[PDB]
Amino acid sequence: MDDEAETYKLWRIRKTIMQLSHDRGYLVTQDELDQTLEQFKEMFGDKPSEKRPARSDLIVLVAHNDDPTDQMFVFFPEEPKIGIKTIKTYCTRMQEENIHRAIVVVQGGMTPSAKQSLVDMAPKYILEQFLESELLINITEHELVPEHVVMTVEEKQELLSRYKLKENMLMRIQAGDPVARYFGLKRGQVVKIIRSSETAGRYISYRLVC
DNA sequence: AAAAAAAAAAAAAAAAAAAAAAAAAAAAAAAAAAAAAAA
């Protein structure tokens, strides 16, 4: 019962990770998005107890459409509580592969010293983290979550020039928001929210990531 | 007839329920530094 449930939750977490990577604009093929449970069992195995697949076997390397040298690692550590040793191992892998972006799918949580390592390591390499329970649901597919589109600096500048706005006068969204963590939004970006309206059909609002 | 002690009148004085945020204390795992055993 452990092997089948573990394979099912690993397949669901991998599907959510690949949908998250496709929503961020990274190069993801259609068969990876439409990968079934039986396809996952054929490709990676179905017995997670005897390392089929291993937790280090499910590492996901993905690249961006516009800039092919901007890539993401997705790590799947097997330890439930993550120390500084595995974080340092992943960081050394990031220097020796020259990649600035990675997401660590932790199981239980992280030590606060490792969180401080993520904080002060941040403006050279971005090292995000995600719980396993948070990645069992694609948040953007919920009926209460409208469409979120990340904007470039040109669209933000055009918005502030058109509406005569300053950046502090806009609405705000926290950096710890599940949608902002899903899209990987850093501080200063502006997210465009397109929602359905019952009086005008649809409505576009703008929020500043703080 | 002048001086002193006790009694009474006049004047100042002090004596209810709910809910959220912040502070605190025991605990508890983690991580860096110091001492000991062995090759």
Side-chain angles (χ1 to χ4, degrees), chain A residues 48 54 71 82 87 96 111 113 122 142 164 182 186 195 203:
Chain A
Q71 293 184 359
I82 293 304
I87 294 298
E96 65 91 19
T111 71
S113 59
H142 203 279
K164 306 292 290 296
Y182 188 91
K186 62 186 286 321
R195 84 176 81 110
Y203 182 66

Side-chain angles (χ1 to χ4, degrees), chain A residues 46-166:
Chain A
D46 43 356
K47 299 288 96 175
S49 54
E50 45 262 24
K51 274 87 176 176
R52 295 294 87 193
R55 296 299 309 275
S56 68
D57 193 72
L58 303 150
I59 175 173
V60 173
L61 179 60
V62 68
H64 193 258
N65 293 318
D66 312 332
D67 189 60
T69 175
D70 174 43
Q71 293 184 359
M72 198 151 51
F73 274 114
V74 186
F75 303 118
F76 290 82
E78 51 93 19
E79 198 74 29
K81 186 59 72 70
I82 293 304
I84 305 174
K85 274 77 69 177
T86 56
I87 294 298
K88 251 57 169 177
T89 305
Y90 293 147
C91 280
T92 46
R93 196 161 181 173
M94 292 177 71
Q95 289 98 24
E96 65 91 19
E97 299 218 17
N98 288 319
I99 277 158
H100 309 268
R101 186 70 57 87
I103 290 182
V104 182
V105 182
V106 306
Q107 200 266 329
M110 293 177 71
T111 71
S113 59
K115 289 183 178 180
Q116 286 300 319
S117 79
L118 304 196
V119 160
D120 68 346
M121 189 66 204
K124 173 176 171 48
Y125 299 152
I126 301 299
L127 198 42
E128 314 168 0
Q129 67 105 28
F130 268 95
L131 313 179
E132 270 202 343
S133 179
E134 305 185 350
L135 287 174
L136 292 166
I137 292 302
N138 203 333
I139 295 95
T140 60
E141 290 183 340
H142 203 279
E143 87 165 348
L144 287 188
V145 192
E147 176 148 35
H148 297 255
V149 172
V150 61
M151 275 145 78
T152 64
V153 294
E154 293 83 3
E155 308 164 281
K156 157 166 162 179
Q157 191 51 254
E158 283 181 355
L159 168 73
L160 298 189
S161 296
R162 156 76 189 88
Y163 275 111
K164 306 292 290 296
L165 271 160
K166 293 175 73 174

Side-chain angles (χ1 to χ4, degrees), chain A residues 146-147 163 171 192-207:
Chain A
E147 176 148 35
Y163 275 111
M171 284 202 264
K192 170 167 77 173
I193 289 172
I194 320 175
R195 84 176 81 110
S196 287
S197 177
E198 62 157 289
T199 47
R202 76 181 75 253
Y203 182 66
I204 286 184
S205 66
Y206 301 92
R207 285 193 183 271

Side-chain angles (χ1 to χ4, degrees), chain A residues 165-187:
Chain A
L165 271 160
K166 293 175 73 174
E167 64 176 0
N168 52 351
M169 293 174 24
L170 276 159
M171 284 202 264
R172 270 174 261 276
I173 171 173
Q174 291 183 331
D177 198 282
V179 171
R181 282 171 60 196
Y182 188 91
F183 276 79
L185 309 178
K186 62 186 286 321
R187 182 174 180 176

